[PDB]
């Protein structure tokens, strides 16, 4: 056991640019059409479409520089420190902003279904004013350690652009904060809100008129089903870095292949809002 080696598979240097280009194409068409239909021609009517517009804006921001990840998957990062920092900071702000928009979607659905009578002012207030200061401003202030720490390496091989940390404990606390911000706390909020939604909707089985819950339920379920195995992979990697799972270097190579492939497959939430807009599902 000399050290821990690094090796990327030759199939992941062709399949991952294919997946990145597919997601980039469907994201750029879908989010451009969604922006040009709702946010420009004033077509949006329901209260959740403002949140879907914000989600499509963050989705467009991630999709427009997904080609840099597509080039990085097969080539080396000859773009620079500025482009590496910018790609990382807008990937982080998109990945947190989409989660916070989905939490706000579930909160608006809870305020509309449970408080059906006395909630028209705070639904509109959540639609216009506090959504910025509760979704974007925590996301912009939560990505300044991504702004500081992310750099491009000057290693003679592969010129890697990644979030570079001083020691291995910083990787652990940042991955745990990544999990606790992306999956655990908003998943708890969304699950509790939807449990209260169904518990108060089963008391009102005598009238069945609204089915705007199905679209948001499908969107949230598809988002979490897309992002779940990447969170499992980074949780297993984080517990590997604690020297708890001492099951060999080959496990730490399989985990790092799984993380990359599953992150490429979990970028497929870019075609989730406009695909659900086209299908009306």
């Amino acid at each position: 056991e000399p050290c821990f080696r690094e090796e990327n598979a030759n199939f992941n240097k062709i399949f991952l640019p294919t997946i990145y280009s597919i997601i980039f194409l469907t994201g750029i068409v879908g989010n451009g059409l969604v922006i040009l239909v709702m946010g420009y021609q004033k077509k949006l009517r329901s209260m959740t479409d403002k949140y879907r517009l914000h989600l499509s804006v963050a989705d467009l921001l991630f999709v427009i520089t997904l080609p840099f990840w597509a080039v990085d998957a097969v080539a080396n990062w000859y773009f620079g420190n500025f482009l590496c920092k910018a790609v990382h900071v807008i990937y982080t702000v998109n990945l947190y902003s989409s989660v916070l928009i989905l939490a706000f979607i579930s909160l608006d659905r809870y305020l509309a279904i449970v408080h059906a009578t006395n909630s028209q002012r705070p639904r509109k207030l959540l639609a216009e004013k506090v959504v910025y200061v509760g979704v974007w401003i925590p996301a912009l202030l939560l990505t300044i350690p991504d702004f500081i720490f992310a750099n491009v390496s000057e290693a003679d091989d592969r010129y890697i652009c990644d979030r570079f940390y001083p020691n291995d404990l910083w990787v652990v606390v940042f991955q745990f904060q990544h999990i606790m911000v992306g999956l655990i706390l908003p998943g708890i909020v969304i699950l509790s809100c939807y449990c209260i939604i169904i518990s108060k909707l089963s008391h009102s089985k005598g009238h069945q008129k609204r089915k705007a819950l199905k679209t948001t339920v499908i969107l949230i379920l598809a988002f979490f089903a897309c992002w779940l195995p990447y969170y499992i992979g980074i949780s297993i990697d984080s517990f590997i870095l604690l020297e708890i799972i001492k099951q060999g270097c080959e496990f730490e190579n399989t985990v790092h292949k799984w993380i990359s492939i599953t992150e490429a497959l979990a970028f497929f939430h870019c075609c989730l809002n406009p695909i659900l807009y086209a299908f009306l599902g």
Binding site: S153, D162, P166
Partner: peptide, 20 residues
Amino acid sequence: NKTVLPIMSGFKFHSKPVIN
């Protein structure tokens, strides 16, 4: 003391040297 690439400790391409 066996060594590795020095300050490669991040989200990806992170390693760990072996002490003597």
